[PDB]
């Protein structure tokens, strides 16, 4: 006799480290203003969440098995729910079993897809066979799947073609415009030696194949000579790509002045400082179903140059908030030239860069509010509960 | 490396209460003469087995949830296996998850199917939604499914069309020929003495519960047409309804008034006494209207006794018509023909005691040649070899 959401996550404060943990935290804060939400999470005991622990009998067993034991405690804890909403494969089996045991609908947000993970050795172990089976099982049986972009929805339906496309919904990611906002320098830019009197082109992200950092470093050879490139590019996912980016950065620094590389992962206030100071933020991703960093740059009122892959064109409004650059994997020479041409056009026309940045924060406030996302998410809970 | 079978069960000695538990107990004993087997079971701690328990912290949750909790401990315990063999939905997810986690084949024996459970109010609960999902998951992904009869093979293929039929194998239940064997009355407490049965007149034996399914009322009806000196020994108790208690009680009293040799044993009997009665009988009658397996027929055959049985369910895979026994056709729309033909088959074996005796000997031969657990274990090991290739 009243809707009660069991929100199932692995990460929740004070143990949020990834995009999926940030998403659940912000979604729950807004959803609680509309309906009753119980947070089901894993890790350390805390007030205000139902913490699902693994079976202590399984101490030292394979991580996949200890994770399933925590899932069964999570199902046990969720007995009051009228709808269960799971996040990440770590809780997929919890939402699947709670749905079966209690007769309640299962809503699943697809943050990532096990079959699309870039191949690493760990994909040869039993753990990946278990995580792949959980995600297939959870996704194919879910009452609703939420994708944050039409791009991610396409990837979900391609990866799991038994899915009813009518059960897969686009509900965008939000951005908190009280955390991400145009901030004058307090200074990370001083500790780098960046000259605030010269244009700044910024990148923020991990060094992975998918994030296309090598394409931006190649493009930067063609920037006007007083332009500074500030690369916030850390935590490379392979030693090979660390060497490729390191080598490309050294070749760039040989050809031009104003190259800066922040190798360490930065907190929010330092990222906000750099995104705010930038005239252009570049997202050169070759695969970007999500593209959250584009919302962060837009909320900091900075013009964006980005590829047209995945979800990016649903966030970056070409000729209004930024400029899209066509990516074709068979013509990376053209991609690199066209990234540079887009950056160069905004650096040459600072009034246009400023207007695009201003429009970017307006789009965040207008179209990518968590309050609006919470309302659309509640509409999915209504459809599956009817 | 060498083959190491993780045999996954809920029931194992000393906590065996049903057919699936008996099956694993006997199969493991004979498989251990051929290959290394680890017993993975649930319930009370014991020597000689990996006993899987739930998470202590899940004490008091839905029974389906604590069963999945025990399954994860069973998967953890089974890490040395080269093949995992599951029995009942209770261990289906243990075999499925061990196959995924360790990269080993999963053999599943189908003793029953969740979607074919005759409706009870408990099929409205979430527990049944969980048991149904486990079984469909485990069966559709198994490297091999062992069906305990032809009918169970047909039900598996009908209920689970996504499983490749080439992966479904019939391997039947066996019989211990050292506990069921032809046995003389013996000088100490002969049960046939106590009851006042005549060793020198023909004995027709029935052993089962008083249920619609076991058809004792059809045998009582047929018994009116037995030749006059024929003794009916009914080992029939535990009526499952007052209605059939009243009906069968009334029918046996009516039979007792009409003819002499009617002996109605209601108390449950131990093996040594069941053996004595089956051994002494000229004919054992299994008049079941529903009988998936028909194992009681193997007890009579191992005691070297002719069988008269209905042709329902699995009975014709155990009783060889015209060789170890006689099958009687059952049509629910014509129970009067069934009762007359039951009598005609019994009367034919009573009228031809050499034939009754030849069928009994063929019955014991069939037990030793085809239904010994040594043969069942050899056929099972062959499925392990096929899936391990
Ligand atoms: Na800016
Ligand atoms: Na006999």
Numbering used by the authors:
A (entry chain A): -1 to 184, 188 to 387
B (entry chain B): -1 to 387
What does the paper say about this structure?
Mycobacterium tuberculosis produces glycogen (also known as α-glucan) to help evade human immunity. This pathogen uses the GlgE pathway to generate glycogen rather than the more well known glycogen synthase GlgA pathway, which is absent in this bacterium. One of the routes to α-maltose-1-phosphate is now known to involve the GlgA homologue GlgM, which uses ADP-glucose as a donor and α-glucose-1-phosphate as an acceptor. Thus, the enzyme uses ADP-glucose as the donor and α-glucose-1-phosphate as the acceptor.
Attempts to crystallize the α-maltose-1-phosphate synthase GlgM from M. tuberculosis were unsuccessful. We therefore switched our focus to the GlgM homologue from M. smegmatis, which shares 77% identity with the enzyme from M. tuberculosis. To help compare GlgA (a GT5 family member) with GlgM enzymes (GT4 family members), the X-ray crystal structure of GlgM from Mycobacterium smegmatis was solved to 1.9 Å resolution. The structural similarity between these proteins confirmed that GlgM had a GT-B fold. While the enzymes shared a GT-B fold and several residues responsible for binding the donor substrate, they differed in some secondary-structural details, particularly in the N-terminal domain, which would be expected to be largely responsible for their different acceptor-substrate specificities. Confirmation that GlgM forms a dimer in solution was obtained using size-exclusion chromatography. This indicated a molecular mass of 107 kDa, which is close to the theoretical mass of a dimer (87 kDa); the slight overestimation of this value could be owing to the elongated aspect of the GlgM homodimer. The kinetics of the enzyme conformed to a ternary-complex mechanism. Although the M. tuberculosis GlgM enzyme exhibited a trace of glycogen synthase activity, which was three orders of magnitude lower than its α-maltose-1-phosphate synthase activity, the M. smegmatis enzyme exhibited no detectable glycogen synthase activity. Likewise, we have been unable to date to obtain ligand-bound structures of GlgM, making it difficult to rationalize these structural differences with respect to function.
